[PDB]
């Protein structure tokens, strides 16, 4: 029952998915099956060299970057890097979603009928199903999350699709629980994509033809299978060793030196992988642990084990029927939940070094959780909130009552309030820089960026401290040594907080912040994107003739209303009599002085 | 003018004399409380307790306008930010009532302000054995010897306000029946040189010395041993080679010395001579850089009670012989940035009662301080609160106060 | 923690570079010539193994000639290299052929066997230790090369951060790399391999201890070429082989289990004293310390805590340059007259202590390698230096003896400032925008020391004998400083303090003008 408790899929659903996948062999493109209130889509597997490695691809691995418009959530929120997926699988998916196939209409009709959607497939086609699930997660679930709209992805021996960025994006959105992948102990198909194309290009067509269940009459060449297995195992061993060395943070200088001389596959497991053996069922939820188990399970033990492993690996690709039929006669164990994993790994054939590596990978997650707990405890301290309360409720009201904006006061003054504000700003900047470094070094859970409280705290800190940082930057005349503040002076933490806030507020809609900005709109590294950076723009625009730059002024005037409405800037302090912005606007010639749209906000 | 006169009519004659004294004392400057108490002690013979009681009684009115006064922490603490300022109208008042007698002026000899001239009322009467219980002379570029003869057969207190760089000393002390207080104040921006210091050795009855910002003359055996001097306070002075030399025994020259203060003085890398005095009772060093370690000869002193070490950076470590002091009641270390660890046997000080280590980057408190039964008050930072409460668990009477760091810009003004 | 020496060895073995280098070395030995060829986009250069050559003589690195080592240190302990290796490298003219055949290459791997391996290591050292880093990356993989070098050379290589590009594979049975004078010091990562696996050691002391214990071991062999061939052949297939790894009784501890597995991989049982000593050496190879990745993040808190000292220094500078006397903050600190000077001295001492602690932590290797490449740390170090170096110069000159003219740029500059300058050397090219006004702080932190030296030279010229030739020579040595100061002033790269009416620079300029007018030299 624990399998149903964890994965959320019953044995009957697994049997129906396997039956649909088997039936999809005869059918073309996709096959739709309606069982009760469940709609299952099975994608037809394809067995050809071009279906795994794209002929047009020039890289050593058939990987291409995703499109931001198509998959806005499949990227890193902070770094901004997009994920990479297989080119052939992406092309097959794009052909599937073509309007001529009527797949979109069927999906819409099934969604409107309030029926659960299950995506299933076998071999490479099954991998395509995973992409389809992501498509669903980018079309309906993200628009309005609901229990009835929760999808289900089931794959049987599907090869790896996404890289580490793909897995991180799946984990951050809490979508990894909807993917279940059944992989045999000796299955070789999931390990195919972990090898370079040049090593196995000669032997790929023969192995792919042999693996085809439709036409198994082809003559078996043991030498070719042995060479293919040897190359795949060597590449998998190299990839796993490098990954486990990098994860533990050891030999970093040696790894950095050797990275340039090595070309390794970037594909990483994504989803809940469950390993099937003769009488046990083990499910793993950690990508590094899944990769280590995938490498270590397919190993020999003695001479009798050899000379038969490649044949068993070839045969096991069509042995999922026995596992599906005999699902209820095998024990189910969770590797992460269990405390003692020695017996399970010994039963599955993992060696001692594999056990140690799996244990280290599991302990890495616990260390990350402990770091997140420590960060939360530090954040929830009384003094951290006291500093922000003092900044918001004492310095700003006093400056406003002093007829001078607090930005201008921080720019030039000689009072103890400025010194205290600078000290508090330095302390807050140090704390946030420590948090940003911890996040950058991949030592925090993927869900940390998804926390609403953290996003709100970061947004408040930015909106309260960024003008002070700009004033400090422009007070010491640092803009004449490096350049504009937004070019090479803006701290990374503010950019990360702004990107997180924009993603949080734009995820229900679907557009990237750039689209919204450009749609609303020389503007290279401009200040019209961030409300808190408006002061910096005033620094750049002032001291220049009106004729040279005019469009930036108009853009600033247009965005000022939105910034005021959203609370990015306060009209009481930035429109003060002694503010530098008022003086700059006074110096502006009479034409724009009379054509400005905020007259009611300035003229008394 | 009338209101404070009426108040003076209501004051006791002793407190009236004290009010006149402080009021006629030089204005527009910060006057330490210790000097004022010493002046009252040697003038009215009221002793320190009654002097402090009088100060507290007079603190109610505006004639003794108080300052921050952080001395409320304990009574064993010294003087720091405790200066008292008075109004110039009160100064003129105290100068008014019977204080311009031509020849006699039985008390309160004053000078309204620094000038290269002397008061014509007393200048004309050169031959005047005037009773001079209180003398305060303010002189700028003019010579200290003056142009007449102050015999002063009954003088008790002498205060001088000085200036310029090259200067001499008057021969008045040579023709002096008795004297107890001698204060020299220099307001220049550069060290001031003094000439003719042998005349000051004529009288040994002096009990307090308040030199400041000057070239401390080197001690010599020809100097008469001051058997009554008790206080030597040097602030912003120039030790140069006066205290560096060790040929002459300072204990023989100053056997009654009990309190020595060195503040804001550089070029003081040698302290063996200071520790060589066996009569030392309260030693305080404040803001003295260029000091590596204290000399390992403090075991000679067996009566030292206070070891205030305010500021004094670049101090590598505390001496191991400090624990041998039998009556070290008070230890004060503040603003130290080079101290990393206390002595291992620091807890053997059975006479220790209060210790201050504010803004001190201490690494680890030794377990020996767990035996500090007599320790009562600890003023430290929040970092050491845990290992001070660990001591407080053993001794319930221990009280720990966390000193908050206040950010002020008042230091920039000075 | 976690034992990873065996993991590092397995990572190194699993790469195709091992087999490619072995094949290249075998081909070079068979052909008896330097073989340069491209395999899988990587240019392998294999140096043939030479013999009938004696080793042991130490002469040192060349000082004058075609070959040079600018990156190598030149302190009191002079780095030394084997005379035979240098002579063979000079005779074979490897440099010319290598630079001719490596034009346009991106990845270069130099390899050799025994003396060939030593020659390959020397060639890689010559390539890396140049005026500028080579356009291509190098990786010297040696197969049982004899020990060469010295303690000074190894220390300089470790300081230069160049040991990561050298790897040596030494069998547990050969005697050629283990038979050398005690003056020789190993350098770079060393791989100890055997029929059941390998281990990697990246510590000179650990490698020396392993060599010593292997020397004390009774088991030794004379034929090592066939042993190396068998070892590489059986290690290239370790991926397709899973062993029991029984290790006797498996300890219930991650570190203990890892150490036991590493010991077992070398063919040493846990019963003989040799196995126990090997286990002790492996345990002592890795030290216990807080994770550098967490320490780098944690450093921001103490940086923020020390920042108020810099804020106080900034406020003091503003007050000094806003004063009526207009003496400049440098001269104000040079003349101890107010308590604010003492407070600023305390803040400067605290900042110097914090930065010295940071530098010591960096040099201890308690932080990641790219710690100094961080933009934030570089900018913070620059901001601290530009504000604290004049204060340190003023303090040194105030405490400087009258007749001890050691100055600040003649061996008295603290090493922390040199490390800060080395970090700033990686800053991108600054923009050439014209400054509208004077900068807040002087760009050159050594301006005050040069000004003091120029003032001393001018005073010496003014107060001396007639000696017209001496005056001409002193003026010739002085006028470069005047030209540099004029260029700095015209570029507006100096703060207002140097432009004060009563500043030291103005007094020096007035004195120079008066001297020129009095005596009449041109220009
Ligand atoms: N010209 C400069 N001089 C000195 N520091 C600079 C300069 N420019 C940027 N910085 C600082 O360099 C760090 C980059 O970290 P970053 O996370 O981006 O690292 P990377 O991800 O890129 O590797 C940010 O903290 C920038 O902080 C700005 O500088 C002002 C003074 O800072 P202060 O508080 O110390 O006085 C602050 O007001 C912020 O405007």
mmCIF file of N, CA, C and O in Angstrom, chain A residues 234 238 241 244 250-254 256-257 260-261 299-300 306 351-353 356-357 414-415 419 422 426 430 433-434 441 443 475-477 480-483 487, chain C residues 4 6-8 11 14 19 107 137 139 164 239-242 244-245 254 257 293-294 297 300-301 304 311 314-315 318 369 376 383 428 431 435-436 438 440:
data_model
loop_
_atom_site.group_PDB
_atom_site.id
_atom_site.type_symbol
_atom_site.label_atom_id
_atom_site.label_comp_id
_atom_site.label_asym_id
_atom_site.label_seq_id
_atom_site.Cartn_x
_atom_site.Cartn_y
_atom_site.Cartn_z
ATOM 1 N N UNK A 234 31.509 2.280 -19.452
ATOM 2 C CA UNK A 234 32.655 3.148 -19.199
ATOM 3 C C UNK A 234 32.225 4.607 -19.084
ATOM 4 O O UNK A 234 32.635 5.320 -18.156
ATOM 5 N N UNK A 238 32.395 7.014 -15.731
ATOM 6 C CA UNK A 238 33.059 8.315 -15.699
ATOM 7 C C UNK A 238 32.107 9.404 -15.215
ATOM 8 O O UNK A 238 32.460 10.219 -14.350
ATOM 9 N N UNK A 241 31.298 8.934 -11.430
ATOM 10 C CA UNK A 241 32.437 9.285 -10.590
ATOM 11 C C UNK A 241 32.626 10.793 -10.523
ATOM 12 O O UNK A 241 32.842 11.351 -9.441
ATOM 13 N N UNK A 244 29.739 12.301 -8.341
ATOM 14 C CA UNK A 244 29.873 12.062 -6.908
ATOM 15 C C UNK A 244 31.072 12.813 -6.341
ATOM 16 O O UNK A 244 31.054 13.231 -5.177
ATOM 17 N N UNK A 250 35.021 17.654 -2.993
ATOM 18 C CA UNK A 250 36.374 17.172 -2.779
ATOM 19 C C UNK A 250 37.141 17.183 -4.094
ATOM 20 O O UNK A 250 36.565 17.006 -5.172
ATOM 21 N N UNK A 251 38.455 17.390 -3.987
ATOM 22 C CA UNK A 251 39.334 17.505 -5.151
ATOM 23 C C UNK A 251 38.816 18.564 -6.119
ATOM 24 O O UNK A 251 38.826 18.385 -7.338
ATOM 25 N N UNK A 252 38.348 19.682 -5.557
ATOM 26 C CA UNK A 252 37.728 20.723 -6.371
ATOM 27 C C UNK A 252 38.721 21.329 -7.356
ATOM 28 O O UNK A 252 38.379 21.574 -8.518
ATOM 29 N N UNK A 253 39.953 21.584 -6.909
ATOM 30 C CA UNK A 253 40.968 22.112 -7.816
ATOM 31 C C UNK A 253 41.306 21.109 -8.912
ATOM 32 O O UNK A 253 41.417 21.477 -10.088
ATOM 33 N N UNK A 254 41.470 19.835 -8.545
ATOM 34 C CA UNK A 254 41.737 18.804 -9.542
ATOM 35 C C UNK A 254 40.566 18.655 -10.506
ATOM 36 O O UNK A 254 40.761 18.532 -11.721
ATOM 37 N N UNK A 256 38.341 20.979 -11.226
ATOM 38 C CA UNK A 256 38.304 22.179 -12.055
ATOM 39 C C UNK A 256 39.336 22.107 -13.173
ATOM 40 O O UNK A 256 39.053 22.487 -14.316
ATOM 41 N N UNK A 257 40.539 21.616 -12.863
ATOM 42 C CA UNK A 257 41.569 21.488 -13.888
ATOM 43 C C UNK A 257 41.187 20.450 -14.938
ATOM 44 O O UNK A 257 41.422 20.654 -16.135
ATOM 45 N N UNK A 260 38.047 20.867 -18.199
ATOM 46 C CA UNK A 260 38.258 21.325 -19.569
ATOM 47 C C UNK A 260 38.661 20.184 -20.494
ATOM 48 O O UNK A 260 38.312 20.195 -21.681
ATOM 49 N N UNK A 261 39.388 19.197 -19.978
ATOM 50 C CA UNK A 261 39.868 18.080 -20.781
ATOM 51 C C UNK A 261 38.854 16.951 -20.908
ATOM 52 O O UNK A 261 39.143 15.954 -21.578
ATOM 53 N N UNK A 299 26.274 -4.231 -12.776
ATOM 54 C CA UNK A 299 27.657 -4.646 -12.603
ATOM 55 C C UNK A 299 27.707 -6.150 -12.377
ATOM 56 O O UNK A 299 26.734 -6.767 -11.936
ATOM 57 N N UNK A 300 28.860 -6.735 -12.685
ATOM 58 C CA UNK A 300 29.061 -8.168 -12.547
ATOM 59 C C UNK A 300 29.603 -8.506 -11.159
ATOM 60 O O UNK A 300 30.071 -7.642 -10.416
ATOM 61 N N UNK A 306 29.614 -12.616 -15.976
ATOM 62 C CA UNK A 306 30.024 -12.154 -17.291
ATOM 63 C C UNK A 306 29.606 -13.162 -18.362
ATOM 64 O O UNK A 306 29.193 -14.288 -18.070
ATOM 65 N N UNK A 351 27.624 -2.564 -4.495
ATOM 66 C CA UNK A 351 28.855 -2.854 -3.779
ATOM 67 C C UNK A 351 29.022 -1.896 -2.600
ATOM 68 O O UNK A 351 28.223 -0.979 -2.388
ATOM 69 N N UNK A 352 30.083 -2.116 -1.818
ATOM 70 C CA UNK A 352 30.309 -1.305 -0.624
ATOM 71 C C UNK A 352 30.555 0.157 -0.978
ATOM 72 O O UNK A 352 30.018 1.060 -0.323
ATOM 73 N N UNK A 353 31.365 0.413 -2.008
ATOM 74 C CA UNK A 353 31.625 1.790 -2.417
ATOM 75 C C UNK A 353 30.356 2.458 -2.929
ATOM 76 O O UNK A 353 30.123 3.646 -2.670
ATOM 77 N N UNK A 356 28.451 3.476 0.129
ATOM 78 C CA UNK A 356 28.996 4.690 0.732
ATOM 79 C C UNK A 356 28.614 5.927 -0.071
ATOM 80 O O UNK A 356 28.262 6.966 0.504
ATOM 81 N N UNK A 357 28.683 5.839 -1.400
ATOM 82 C CA UNK A 357 28.326 6.982 -2.236
ATOM 83 C C UNK A 357 26.845 7.323 -2.106
ATOM 84 O O UNK A 357 26.476 8.503 -2.038
ATOM 85 N N UNK A 414 25.817 64.807 8.308
ATOM 86 C CA UNK A 414 26.806 64.591 9.356
ATOM 87 C C UNK A 414 26.147 64.292 10.699
ATOM 88 O O UNK A 414 26.689 64.647 11.751
ATOM 89 N N UNK A 415 24.986 63.647 10.686
ATOM 90 C CA UNK A 415 24.250 63.336 11.901
ATOM 91 C C UNK A 415 24.410 61.865 12.271
ATOM 92 O O UNK A 415 24.768 61.025 11.442
ATOM 93 N N UNK A 419 24.796 57.668 10.363
ATOM 94 C CA UNK A 419 25.756 56.637 10.742
ATOM 95 C C UNK A 419 25.050 55.357 11.174
ATOM 96 O O UNK A 419 25.444 54.253 10.773
ATOM 97 N N UNK A 422 23.593 53.661 8.123
ATOM 98 C CA UNK A 422 24.644 53.009 7.349
ATOM 99 C C UNK A 422 25.089 51.709 8.007
ATOM 100 O O UNK A 422 25.315 50.706 7.321
ATOM 101 N N UNK A 426 24.704 48.050 6.358
ATOM 102 C CA UNK A 426 25.846 47.159 6.184
ATOM 103 C C UNK A 426 25.572 45.785 6.781
ATOM 104 O O UNK A 426 25.898 44.760 6.172
ATOM 105 N N UNK A 430 25.343 42.344 4.664
ATOM 106 C CA UNK A 430 26.168 41.185 4.964
ATOM 107 C C UNK A 430 25.352 39.919 5.139
ATOM 108 O O UNK A 430 25.709 38.857 4.615
ATOM 109 N N UNK A 433 24.037 38.880 1.774
ATOM 110 C CA UNK A 433 25.119 38.359 0.947
ATOM 111 C C UNK A 433 25.492 36.943 1.362
ATOM 112 O O UNK A 433 25.786 36.100 0.510
ATOM 113 N N UNK A 434 25.491 36.665 2.669
ATOM 114 C CA UNK A 434 25.718 35.296 3.123
ATOM 115 C C UNK A 434 24.637 34.359 2.595
ATOM 116 O O UNK A 434 24.936 33.259 2.108
ATOM 117 N N UNK A 441 25.945 28.556 -4.023
ATOM 118 C CA UNK A 441 26.773 27.363 -3.911
ATOM 119 C C UNK A 441 25.964 26.069 -3.900
ATOM 120 O O UNK A 441 26.531 25.012 -3.600
ATOM 121 N N UNK A 443 23.792 24.858 -1.879
ATOM 122 C CA UNK A 443 23.766 24.234 -0.563
ATOM 123 C C UNK A 443 22.430 24.436 0.143
ATOM 124 O O UNK A 443 22.357 24.323 1.371
ATOM 125 N N UNK A 475 27.608 58.592 -3.528
ATOM 126 C CA UNK A 475 28.192 59.592 -2.641
ATOM 127 C C UNK A 475 29.714 59.596 -2.727
ATOM 128 O O UNK A 475 30.339 60.662 -2.684
ATOM 129 N N UNK A 476 30.323 58.421 -2.862
ATOM 130 C CA UNK A 476 31.771 58.288 -2.919
ATOM 131 C C UNK A 476 32.324 58.445 -4.330
ATOM 132 O O UNK A 476 33.509 58.178 -4.549
ATOM 133 N N UNK A 477 31.489 58.865 -5.283
ATOM 134 C CA UNK A 477 31.908 59.094 -6.668
ATOM 135 C C UNK A 477 32.495 57.828 -7.291
ATOM 136 O O UNK A 477 33.471 57.878 -8.041
ATOM 137 N N UNK A 480 32.300 57.234 -11.449
ATOM 138 C CA UNK A 480 33.302 57.747 -12.373
ATOM 139 C C UNK A 480 34.507 56.827 -12.512
ATOM 140 O O UNK A 480 35.396 57.112 -13.321
ATOM 141 N N UNK A 481 34.561 55.736 -11.749
ATOM 142 C CA UNK A 481 35.661 54.784 -11.817
ATOM 143 C C UNK A 481 35.291 53.500 -12.547
ATOM 144 O O UNK A 481 36.089 52.993 -13.340
ATOM 145 N N UNK A 482 34.098 52.964 -12.299
ATOM 146 C CA UNK A 482 33.636 51.739 -12.940
ATOM 147 C C UNK A 482 32.579 51.978 -14.004
ATOM 148 O O UNK A 482 32.601 51.318 -15.045
ATOM 149 N N UNK A 483 31.652 52.904 -13.774
ATOM 150 C CA UNK A 483 30.618 53.199 -14.735
ATOM 151 C C UNK A 483 29.259 53.371 -14.089
ATOM 152 O O UNK A 483 29.144 53.727 -12.912
ATOM 153 N N UNK A 487 25.249 48.984 -14.493
ATOM 154 C CA UNK A 487 26.117 48.247 -15.406
ATOM 155 C C UNK A 487 27.029 47.288 -14.650
ATOM 156 O O UNK A 487 27.045 46.083 -14.921
ATOM 157 N N UNK C 4 38.084 10.727 0.194
ATOM 158 C CA UNK C 4 37.903 10.856 -1.247
ATOM 159 C C UNK C 4 39.194 10.663 -2.035
ATOM 160 O O UNK C 4 39.202 10.902 -3.248
ATOM 161 N N UNK C 6 40.727 7.770 -2.689
ATOM 162 C CA UNK C 6 40.430 6.680 -3.611
ATOM 163 C C UNK C 6 39.405 7.108 -4.652
ATOM 164 O O UNK C 6 39.475 6.686 -5.812
ATOM 165 N N UNK C 7 38.443 7.945 -4.256
ATOM 166 C CA UNK C 7 37.484 8.475 -5.220
ATOM 167 C C UNK C 7 38.179 9.329 -6.272
ATOM 168 O O UNK C 7 37.869 9.233 -7.466
ATOM 169 N N UNK C 8 39.126 10.172 -5.849
ATOM 170 C CA UNK C 8 39.882 10.976 -6.804
ATOM 171 C C UNK C 8 40.704 10.095 -7.736
ATOM 172 O O UNK C 8 40.788 10.360 -8.943
ATOM 173 N N UNK C 11 38.351 8.604 -10.252
ATOM 174 C CA UNK C 11 37.961 9.620 -11.226
ATOM 175 C C UNK C 11 39.065 9.822 -12.254
ATOM 176 O O UNK C 11 38.805 9.895 -13.462
ATOM 177 N N UNK C 14 39.246 6.668 -14.597
ATOM 178 C CA UNK C 14 38.126 6.456 -15.508
ATOM 179 C C UNK C 14 38.223 7.299 -16.774
ATOM 180 O O UNK C 14 37.573 6.969 -17.771
ATOM 181 N N UNK C 19 44.467 6.027 -20.785
ATOM 182 C CA UNK C 19 44.799 5.103 -21.864
ATOM 183 C C UNK C 19 45.469 5.824 -23.025
ATOM 184 O O UNK C 19 46.406 5.294 -23.633
ATOM 185 N N UNK C 107 43.961 22.163 -26.468
ATOM 186 C CA UNK C 107 44.216 21.239 -25.369
ATOM 187 C C UNK C 107 45.504 20.483 -25.658
ATOM 188 O O UNK C 107 45.628 19.840 -26.706
ATOM 189 N N UNK C 137 45.804 24.865 -22.392
ATOM 190 C CA UNK C 137 45.953 24.212 -21.102
ATOM 191 C C UNK C 137 46.860 22.994 -21.229
ATOM 192 O O UNK C 137 46.904 22.329 -22.268
ATOM 193 N N UNK C 139 48.685 19.438 -19.099
ATOM 194 C CA UNK C 139 48.498 18.439 -18.049
ATOM 195 C C UNK C 139 49.632 17.427 -18.182
ATOM 196 O O UNK C 139 49.614 16.588 -19.087
ATOM 197 N N UNK C 164 48.232 21.489 -9.537
ATOM 198 C CA UNK C 164 47.052 20.775 -10.008
ATOM 199 C C UNK C 164 47.210 20.268 -11.436
ATOM 200 O O UNK C 164 46.460 19.376 -11.848
ATOM 201 N N UNK C 239 35.998 -0.224 -14.589
ATOM 202 C CA UNK C 239 34.603 0.201 -14.644
ATOM 203 C C UNK C 239 33.665 -0.993 -14.766
ATOM 204 O O UNK C 239 32.626 -1.048 -14.097
ATOM 205 N N UNK C 240 34.012 -1.958 -15.612
ATOM 206 C CA UNK C 240 33.198 -3.158 -15.800
ATOM 207 C C UNK C 240 33.636 -4.282 -14.866
ATOM 208 O O UNK C 240 33.907 -5.403 -15.294
ATOM 209 N N UNK C 241 33.706 -3.981 -13.571
ATOM 210 C CA UNK C 241 34.149 -4.959 -12.581
ATOM 211 C C UNK C 241 33.728 -4.477 -11.204
ATOM 212 O O UNK C 241 34.176 -3.415 -10.758
ATOM 213 N N UNK C 242 32.878 -5.247 -10.531
ATOM 214 C CA UNK C 242 32.447 -4.949 -9.171
ATOM 215 C C UNK C 242 32.960 -6.044 -8.247
ATOM 216 O O UNK C 242 32.702 -7.230 -8.480
ATOM 217 N N UNK C 244 33.714 -7.548 -4.097
ATOM 218 C CA UNK C 244 32.974 -7.667 -2.845
ATOM 219 C C UNK C 244 33.327 -6.543 -1.877
ATOM 220 O O UNK C 244 32.451 -6.031 -1.171
ATOM 221 N N UNK C 245 34.600 -6.146 -1.835
ATOM 222 C CA UNK C 245 35.095 -5.150 -0.883
ATOM 223 C C UNK C 245 34.756 -5.552 0.550
ATOM 224 O O UNK C 245 34.207 -4.772 1.331
ATOM 225 N N UNK C 254 31.658 6.100 8.509
ATOM 226 C CA UNK C 254 31.932 6.465 7.122
ATOM 227 C C UNK C 254 33.424 6.671 6.887
ATOM 228 O O UNK C 254 33.996 6.128 5.934
ATOM 229 N N UNK C 257 35.307 3.311 7.326
ATOM 230 C CA UNK C 257 35.058 2.435 6.186
ATOM 231 C C UNK C 257 35.812 2.910 4.951
ATOM 232 O O UNK C 257 36.391 2.098 4.219
ATOM 233 N N UNK C 293 33.355 26.078 2.062
ATOM 234 C CA UNK C 293 32.196 26.613 1.358
ATOM 235 C C UNK C 293 31.267 27.341 2.325
ATOM 236 O O UNK C 293 30.652 28.354 1.970
ATOM 237 N N UNK C 294 31.149 26.841 3.557
ATOM 238 C CA UNK C 294 30.357 27.532 4.569
ATOM 239 C C UNK C 294 31.107 28.724 5.151
ATOM 240 O O UNK C 294 30.496 29.750 5.472
ATOM 241 N N UNK C 297 30.794 31.893 2.988
ATOM 242 C CA UNK C 297 29.513 32.558 3.198
ATOM 243 C C UNK C 297 29.463 33.252 4.554
ATOM 244 O O UNK C 297 28.938 34.365 4.668
ATOM 245 N N UNK C 300 30.924 37.080 5.533
ATOM 246 C CA UNK C 300 30.222 38.341 5.310
ATOM 247 C C UNK C 300 29.782 38.977 6.622
ATOM 248 O O UNK C 300 29.761 40.207 6.745
ATOM 249 N N UNK C 301 29.418 38.160 7.614
ATOM 250 C CA UNK C 301 28.948 38.708 8.882
ATOM 251 C C UNK C 301 30.047 39.485 9.598
ATOM 252 O O UNK C 301 29.830 40.623 10.035
ATOM 253 N N UNK C 304 30.808 42.707 7.754
ATOM 254 C CA UNK C 304 29.866 43.762 8.112
ATOM 255 C C UNK C 304 30.145 44.300 9.509
ATOM 256 O O UNK C 304 29.986 45.500 9.763
ATOM 257 N N UNK C 311 33.658 53.027 8.277
ATOM 258 C CA UNK C 311 32.743 54.166 8.311
ATOM 259 C C UNK C 311 33.299 55.296 9.172
ATOM 260 O O UNK C 311 33.221 56.474 8.797
ATOM 261 N N UNK C 314 36.030 57.024 7.285
ATOM 262 C CA UNK C 314 35.460 57.914 6.276
ATOM 263 C C UNK C 314 34.967 59.215 6.899
ATOM 264 O O UNK C 314 35.211 60.304 6.363
ATOM 265 N N UNK C 315 34.262 59.119 8.028
ATOM 266 C CA UNK C 315 33.762 60.323 8.684
ATOM 267 C C UNK C 315 34.906 61.196 9.186
ATOM 268 O O UNK C 315 34.837 62.429 9.102
ATOM 269 N N UNK C 318 36.304 63.024 6.211
ATOM 270 C CA UNK C 318 35.419 64.125 5.839
ATOM 271 C C UNK C 318 35.584 65.307 6.786
ATOM 272 O O UNK C 318 35.669 66.460 6.343
ATOM 273 N N UNK C 369 39.323 28.017 -4.125
ATOM 274 C CA UNK C 369 40.344 28.639 -4.963
ATOM 275 C C UNK C 369 39.841 29.942 -5.570
ATOM 276 O O UNK C 369 40.581 30.930 -5.640
ATOM 277 N N UNK C 376 32.909 40.819 -5.349
ATOM 278 C CA UNK C 376 32.601 41.511 -4.102
ATOM 279 C C UNK C 376 33.829 41.607 -3.205
ATOM 280 O O UNK C 376 34.118 42.668 -2.639
ATOM 281 N N UNK C 383 38.403 48.928 -1.655
ATOM 282 C CA UNK C 383 37.853 50.025 -0.865
ATOM 283 C C UNK C 383 38.580 50.164 0.464
ATOM 284 O O UNK C 383 38.860 51.282 0.913
ATOM 285 N N UNK C 428 38.778 43.912 -14.439
ATOM 286 C CA UNK C 428 38.614 44.211 -15.852
ATOM 287 C C UNK C 428 39.117 45.622 -16.165
ATOM 288 O O UNK C 428 39.380 46.436 -15.275
ATOM 289 N N UNK C 431 36.945 51.940 -17.499
ATOM 290 C CA UNK C 431 36.531 52.863 -18.545
ATOM 291 C C UNK C 431 37.400 54.116 -18.526
ATOM 292 O O UNK C 431 37.865 54.564 -17.476
ATOM 293 N N UNK C 435 36.948 62.297 -15.834
ATOM 294 C CA UNK C 435 36.369 62.616 -14.537
ATOM 295 C C UNK C 435 35.942 64.077 -14.493
ATOM 296 O O UNK C 435 36.710 64.973 -14.859
ATOM 297 N N UNK C 436 34.707 64.317 -14.045
ATOM 298 C CA UNK C 436 34.201 65.684 -13.968
ATOM 299 C C UNK C 436 34.870 66.461 -12.842
ATOM 300 O O UNK C 436 35.112 67.667 -12.972
ATOM 301 N N UNK C 438 37.409 65.964 -8.862
ATOM 302 C CA UNK C 438 38.406 65.162 -8.166
ATOM 303 C C UNK C 438 37.759 63.946 -7.514
ATOM 304 O O UNK C 438 36.631 64.013 -7.017
ATOM 305 N N UNK C 440 37.103 60.897 -4.775
ATOM 306 C CA UNK C 440 36.975 60.920 -3.322
ATOM 307 C C UNK C 440 38.282 60.527 -2.645
ATOM 308 O O UNK C 440 38.687 61.145 -1.653
#
